[PDB]
Every structure is written in structure tokens, then in C-alpha cells.
Amino acid sequence: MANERMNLMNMAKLSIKGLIESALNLGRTLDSDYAPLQQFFVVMEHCLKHGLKANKSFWGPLELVEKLVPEAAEITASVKDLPGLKTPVGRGRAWLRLALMQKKLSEYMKALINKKELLSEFYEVNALMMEEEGAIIAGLLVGLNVIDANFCMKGEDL
């Protein structure tokens, strides 16, 4: 457990740094095809899934966000009650991508680890989010604020 926390963190730490790095060299905006980005979201998903008590999954902890940060109210309304997204996990994923497009990822995460009594209904006493590793990740997610992304196209528009 205490290790699975560092295995995840050190994972997240590398992904974040490898995304920002890969991103600066490219120079263009990202979509949902950029491999380094899909990686991040997956890892990211493993950190929020870890610790969760025994069904919404890592979605429940995120739903909370808009209650702490009213700014995350629009993206939370865009993902739920949507015909396509039927799974709580599916909604969570979509949310993270939407939040990442606002460069609000670290802001929302820092607000969740800053409220451990609220986050204790979703995570166990020693979950990554309930421990210091979750604080490290939230602080690192500040680097993704220099990454421009957009996962909203396929229909011409030109």
C-alpha cells in the first residue's frame, strides 16, 4: 500500500514531465490522439482509483469538485446525463479531459486533498489522495497549465 502509493506517484511524476517535455518540442495543440496524453489520463486514473472504498468509482470524488470550486460546474454538467456516457468511470474520464482543457486540473485536485474530511467518504485512510503522494501530484499538475489541448473535433468545421 505505502509502496503502491509511490509506484503510482513516481509513475505520475514521469508522465507529467514527459508530457510537458514532449509538448514543448511539438509546438502544436493536442487532441485525443497524442499518445503521451492518453498515458497521463490512464495513470492519473490509477491514482484516483487507488484507495477508493468498496458504485461511482473515482467519479464520486470528482463530482465533489464543483461544490468546492463553482468554476468546475460547467464541465461537470457537460459530462453527466449525456446519452453516450453511461458509466460513472466513463464520466470521470471525460471530466478529466474537459478539466485539462481549462488548465484547471491542479486547481481542482489541490482543492480535493485540501478537504480530507470530505474526501474520506470515497477514500481509505491511506489512499494516494488521502496521503502525501496525492498532494505531490496535485502540485505537479501545475505544469500542465502550459499545455494547450482540444478533444472536440471530427466534423469538418472548415
From Swiss-Prot:
Subcellular location(s) of the protein: Cytoplasm; Endomembrane system; Cell projection, Invadopodium; Cell projection, Growth cone
Assigned keywords, A-Z: Cell junction, Cell projection, Coiled coil, Cytoplasm, Developmental protein, Differentiation, Lysosome, Membrane, Neurogenesis, Oncogene, Phosphoprotein
Disulfide bond sites: none
Tissue spec. comment: Expressed in brain (at protein level).
Keyword hit for Coiled coil: yes
Entry annotated with the keyword Cytoplasm: yes
GO biological process, one term: cell differentiation
Superkingdom classification of source: Eukaryota
Domain RUN: start-end pairs: 31-156
GO terms, molecular function: dynactin binding
Post-translational modification: Phosphorylated by PAK1. Isoform 1 is partially phosphorylated.
GO cellular component, one term: dendrite
Domain notes from UniProt: The second coiled coil domain is involved in the interaction with GTP-bound ARL8B.
Physiological role: ARL8 effector that promotes the coupling of endolysosomes to dynein-dynactin for retrograde transport along microtubules. Acts by binding both GTP-bound ARL8 and dynein-dynactin. In nonneuronal cells, promotes concentration of endolysosomes in the juxtanuclear area. In hippocampal neurons, drives retrograde transport of endolysosomes from the axon to the soma. Plays a role in the generation of neuronal polarity formation and axon growth. Implicated in the formation of a single axon by developing neurons.
Subunit structure: Interacts with PAK1. Interacts (via C-terminus) with Ras-related Rab-5 proteins. Interacts (via C-terminus) with Ras-related Rap-2 proteins. Interacts with PIK3CA and PIK3R1. Interacts (via N-terminus) with FSCN1; this interaction induces neuron axon development. Interacts with DBN1. Interacts (via the second coiled coil) with GTP-, but not GDP-bound ARL8A and ARL8B. Interacts with dynactin/DCTN1 and the dynein intermediate chain DYNC1I1/2. Directly interacts with DYNC1LI1.
Protein name (database record): Protein RUFY3
Species of origin: Mus musculus
Gene: Rufy3
